[PDB]
Amino acid sequence: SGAIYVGNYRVVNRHLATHNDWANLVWEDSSRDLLVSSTTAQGCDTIARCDCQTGVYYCSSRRKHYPVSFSKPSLIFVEASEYYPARYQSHLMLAVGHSEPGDCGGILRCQHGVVGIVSTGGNGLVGFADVRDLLWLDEE
Ligand SMILES: CSc1ccccc1CC(=O)N1CC(O)C1
Numbered sequence: 578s579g580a581i582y583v584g585n586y587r588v589v590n591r592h593l594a595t596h597n598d599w600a601n602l603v604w605e606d607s608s609r610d611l612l613v614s615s616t617t618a619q620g621c622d623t624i625a626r627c628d629c630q631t632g633v634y635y636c637s638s639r640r641k642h643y644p645v646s647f648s649k650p651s652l653i654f655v656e657a658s659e660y661y662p663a664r665y666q667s668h669l670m671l672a673v674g675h676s677e678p679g680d681c682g683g684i685l686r687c688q689h690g691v692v693g694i695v696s697t698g699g700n701g702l703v704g705f706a707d708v709r710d711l712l713w714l715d716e717e
């Protein structure tokens with residue numbers, strides 16, 4: 578589990594969105610595994626606007642933050658899970674790092690701010706849904 582709280586937005590994995598998220602929906606995209614809902618309180622996270630390929634992510638199944646090198650956002654075939662059949666996921670970045678299904682939502686961050694959230698993984702890989710191209714998260 579986990580979310581990004583920026584401005585009056587809450588960014589979560591679409592497959593973990595709650596009824597309150599769907600009832601306060603701003604934007605969702607199944608191919609990216611992302612959903613954004615509106616919040617009453619202002620959040621403290623800031624989004625990175627960069628092309629970093631090194632950062633740190635939080636892994637709840639280890640209660641630890643790990644440094645990682647990650648790929649650029651791309652269209653990758655992701656195996657079937659409890660939440661989606663096997664399909665192509667867009668804006669996804671891969672790294673070598675531990676992950677389990679419930680690690681989805683952990684933040685990946687670089688020197689500039691939040692880069693994305695854990696979305697996929699297995700066998701010593703972890704994939705992150707990028708949010709750096711969603712410029713509208715910084716306004717309204
Ligand atoms: C960190 S996810 C993970 C990790 C290890 C093993 C399996 C998973 C589940 C997974 O691939 N998915 C949830 C959906 O969005 C795609």
Ligand SMILES: [Zn+2]
Pocket residue numbers: 625626627628629687688689690
């Ligand atoms: Zn950066």
